[PDB]
C-alpha cells in the first residue's frame, strides 16, 4: 500500500484510525499514529491487507504510537488533501495563532488555527497531558491523522475532540471546538524515528 498521511487503516479487523506520517527507524519503515488506536503487536491493515503491527505506544498520559511496516509498503512524504497531496517538508513546530490543517478518514482535510498548547484531555481511560489544541474540526475515525501546516511542517497526530452526537465537531462554530493533537517532535525522539520528507 502507499502510505500517505490521513488515510484509513484498521486495527485487528475492528477499529479504524488514520495514518499520521511516514517515518523510518534505520532500515525499518513505519508510520506514527495515536496510541489509543491499538496495543503493541495489534495488526494494521490498509484496504484489507496486513501492512504491519503496532511496535510501541503510550496511552493514556501521552497518546502516541508507531506501526512497523513490512518491506513491501511504499512510504511517501505526503498527506492526503482530497485527491491532492500536501508534501511533508519537516517538523518545525508552529506557534499559537498559526494556521494548521489536519487530514483523516472521517472528515477529510480540515483547517483552522492553533489556539492553545499544553492542554490536558480527560478521557475515560485517564488524562493525556501536553496536547496542542486547534479549532479545525474532526470526527471519530480521524484519530492518528496528520496535523500539518500548508507549508508542509508536520505538527502532530490527532488525539481527541469535543464531538457532538453526529460524531464530529464540524457542526458547531470554530470558537467552540477543541480538537487536540499529540506533538510530533517527542514521538520522533522517543522512538528514534526520522520523518520521510520530499
Amino acid at each position: 500500500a502507499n502510505i500517505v498521511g490521513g488515510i484509513e487503516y484498521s486495527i485487528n479487523n475492528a477499529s479504524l484510525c488514520s495514518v499520521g506520517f511516514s517515518v523510518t527507524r534505520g532500515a525499518t519503515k513505519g508510520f506514527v499514529t495515536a496510541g489509543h488506536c491499538g496495543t503493541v503487536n495489534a495488526t494494521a491493515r490498509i484496504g484489507g491487507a496486513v501492512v504491519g503491527t503496532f511496535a510501541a505506544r503510550v496511552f493514556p498520559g501521552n497518546d502516541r504510537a508507531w506501526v512497523s511496516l513490512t518491506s513491501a509498503q511504499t512510504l511517501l512524504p505526503r498527506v492526503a488533501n482530497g485527491s491532492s497531496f500536501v508534501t511533508v517538508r519537516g517538523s518545525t513546530e508552529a506557534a499559537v495563532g498559526a494556521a494548521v490543517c489536519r487530514s483523516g478518514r472521517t472528515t477529510g482535510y480540515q483547517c483552522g488555527t492553533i489556539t492553545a498548547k499544553n492542554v490536558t484531555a480527560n478521557y475515560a481511560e485517564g488524562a493525556v497531558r501536553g496536547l496542542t489544541q486547534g479549532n479545525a474540526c474532526a470526527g471519530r475515525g480521524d484519530s492518528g491523522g496528520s496535523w500539518i501546516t500548508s507549508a508542509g511542517q508536520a505538527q502532530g497526530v490527532m488525539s481527541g475532540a469535543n464531538v457532538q452526537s453526529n460524531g464530529n465537531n464540524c457542526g458547531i462554530p470554530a470558537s467552540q471546538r477543541s480538537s487536540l493533537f499529540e506533538r510530533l517532535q517527542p514521538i520522533l525522539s522517543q522512538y528514534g524515528l526520522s520523518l520521510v520528507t520530499g
Binding site: 484510525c17 495515536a34 489509543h36 497518546d63 484531555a121 480527560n122 478521557y123 475515560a124 481511560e125 474532526a138 470526527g139 471519530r140 475515525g141 480521524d142 484519530s143 490527532m158 488525539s159 481527541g160 475532540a161 469535543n162 464531538v163 477543541s178 487536540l180
Partner: peptide, 4 residues
C-alpha cells in the same frame, strides 16, 4: 473531549 473524547478520543477519536
Amino acid at each position: 473531549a473524547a478520543p477519536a
